[PDB]
Structure 1
Amino acid sequence: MGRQFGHLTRVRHVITYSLSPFEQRAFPHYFSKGIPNVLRRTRACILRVAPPFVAFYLVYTWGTQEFEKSKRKNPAAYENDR
């Protein structure tokens, strides 16, 4: 579509190395460094992700609590008596 490898950009003085997929393990150090990585990733975002959704649960735990209280009858039987 008028754009393909060959004219994308001008790259100079960059050397890359790579291995054959058959000469390297597909799952290298999965839990050795992947698990410590996810802890690093989660911390970097838990201060921007959790607080917005923590508030929603607070709305949930209060909006639903008040709704049942409305359906619950209140002791307003005075002024009629026997």
Structure 2
Amino acid sequence: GRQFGHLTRVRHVITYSLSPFEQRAFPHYFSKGIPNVLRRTRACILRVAPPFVAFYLVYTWGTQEFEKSKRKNPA
């Protein structure tokens, strides 16, 4: 199934739209653009970053312990 005309029921909502040949494709691209991206980054760092640094630390350590385990001093 599918099809427009049979999706669902909606009432009382107006939608104003504009021809693409009437507006610009990049309104305030950097002006509003960058602030947004920072915001999105902020919104997600605490959830995305922590596991990755946890891997990073385990990666560099695990590497050092490997290299330094293959040498001997006394005994």
TM range (shorter): over 0.9
Shift of 1:73: 2.1
Shift of 1:70: 1.1
Shift of 1:31: 0.3
* Local SS of the residue matching 1:32: coil
Shift of 1:36: 0.2
In the alignment, structure 2 segments of 5+ residues that lack a partner are: none
Structure 2 CA distance for aligned equivalents of residues 51 and 13 of structure 1: 45
Structure 2 CA distance for aligned equivalents of residues 57 and 3 of structure 1: 46
Structure with more of its chain in helix, by fraction: 1
Flag the structure with larger Rg: 1
* Local SS of the residue matching 2:11: coil
Shift of 1:50: 0.4
Structure 2 length-normalised TM: 0.94
> How many aligned positions are there?
74
- The CA deviation string for residues 42-75 of structure 1, in whole angstroms up to 9 with x for no partner, is 0000000000001001001110000001112222
Calculate the aligned-residue CA RMSD, in Å. 0.7
Structure 1 CA distance for aligned equivalents of residues 73 and 16 of structure 2: 76
In the alignment, structure 1 segments of 5+ residues that lack a partner are: 76-82
| Runs ≥4 residues deviating over 2 A | none
* Local SS of the residue matching 2:8: coil
